[PDB]
């Protein structure tokens with residue numbers, strides 16, 4: 001045995017960007033890997049591990065919006081990608097769909113990770129509508145290839161970022177909001193592995209809900225005071241940024257963390273919120289953690305799968 005190990009792999013520009021910002025934000029117990037055709041971007045990566053793919057193919061340039069180049073680049077560097085993944089129990093592959101490198105290389109990276117035995121989760125963006133129909137169509141083909149290669153896929157349409165900004169919100173601030181989805185998902189699973197809960201969930205439960213599943217929702221809700229459990233549950237299952245909503249979920253992993261005041265009744269309330277919002281009979285795998293360092297705060301974390 002061993003404690004399950006997580007790796008986060010950014011593929012292409014947006015994925016590299018997300019890795020850098022996640023490192024800026026602070027992340028423990030996760031190995032970051034930056035993968036790119038673009039050697040200039042890779043040289044600026046904050047990631048401990050860097051893989052320049054397609055050296056012979058692009059000679060250190062990007063893939064110039066041709067997803068076939070990203071795919072061939074990943075295939076040319078297959079052994080390097082294998083060596084960088086080796087040992088991971090879980091791999092998150094993050095990439096912006098629509099360009100040349102991520103669209104083509106990220107599904108190959110995901111396929112390698114899954115063939116190497118890792119639980120493989122993709123977190124990808126679709127391009128803004130203002131980038132045009134061709135970019136959207138190219139990205140859609142990437143999303144489909146991603147879905148065929150991963151265990152579970154989280155898709156963030158970049159157009160959703162236009163729903164959470166005002167007319168002055170800096171573009172980089174909007175990008176950081178999108179980063180929260182992956183980042184807090186990683187932090188949640190890390191905490192799940194590391195702590196023996198009063199009603200415990202561990203990596204085998206993660207595998208049961210996420211293995212070979214397709215579309216997924218991951219979310220988290222923190223609340224306090226009067227209706228804290230219902231509120232936190234509602235916040236966990238309702239991100240404005242995700243393409244896949246909770247509605248239709250057949251499998252759910254749900255954890256509630258609270259202080260010593262965490263009540264049985266409010267645990268039921270929270271679990272019921274997820275049940276009814278799913279509008280399905282949900283196979284729930286339910287966990288609970290008492291963190292006495294919490295006072296009046298409750299945290300609800302949800303991963304939902306089983307839509308397809």
Ligand SMILES: CC1=CC(C)=[N+]2C1=Cc1ccc(CCC(=O)OC[C@@H](Oc3ccc(F)c(C(N)=O)c3F)c3nc(-c4ccc(C(F)(F)F)cc4)c(Br)o3)n1[B-]2(F)F
Pocket residue numbers: 121152183184185186187188189190191192193194195196197198199200201202216217218220221222253254255257287288289297299300301302303
């Ligand atoms: C700044 C700030 C204030 C507050 C309040 N916070 C902040 C920042 C962050 C960042 C993340 C969080 C909340 C994390 C969370 O609470 O996660 C619970 C985790 O579960 C656990 C955890 C421990 C256990 F002992 C057990 C168990 N019973 O042994 C247990 F179950 C959990 N992770 C997942 C999960 C499932 C799928 C996915 C994927 F994306 F991969 F698809 C990711 C995560 C689930 Br489902 O559950 N905060 B935050 F605390 F809100």
Ligand SMILES: Nc1nc2c(ncn2[C@@H]2O[C@H](COP(=O)(O)OP(=O)(O)O)[C@@H](O)[C@H]2O)c(=O)[nH]1
Pocket residue numbers: 011012013014015017018062063064065095096097098099100101102103125126127128131135158175178
């Ligand atoms: N949300 C977000 N989307 C991004 C970011 N960077 C790029 N994108 C999106 O990702 C798409 C592909 O860009 P990029 O990753 O640079 O292309 P690649 O390097 O060829 O894979 C773009 O068309 C944008 O829609 C980012 O930092 N955040």
Ligand SMILES: [Ca+2]
Pocket residue numbers: 191192193194195196197200201202
């Ligand atoms: Ca646990």
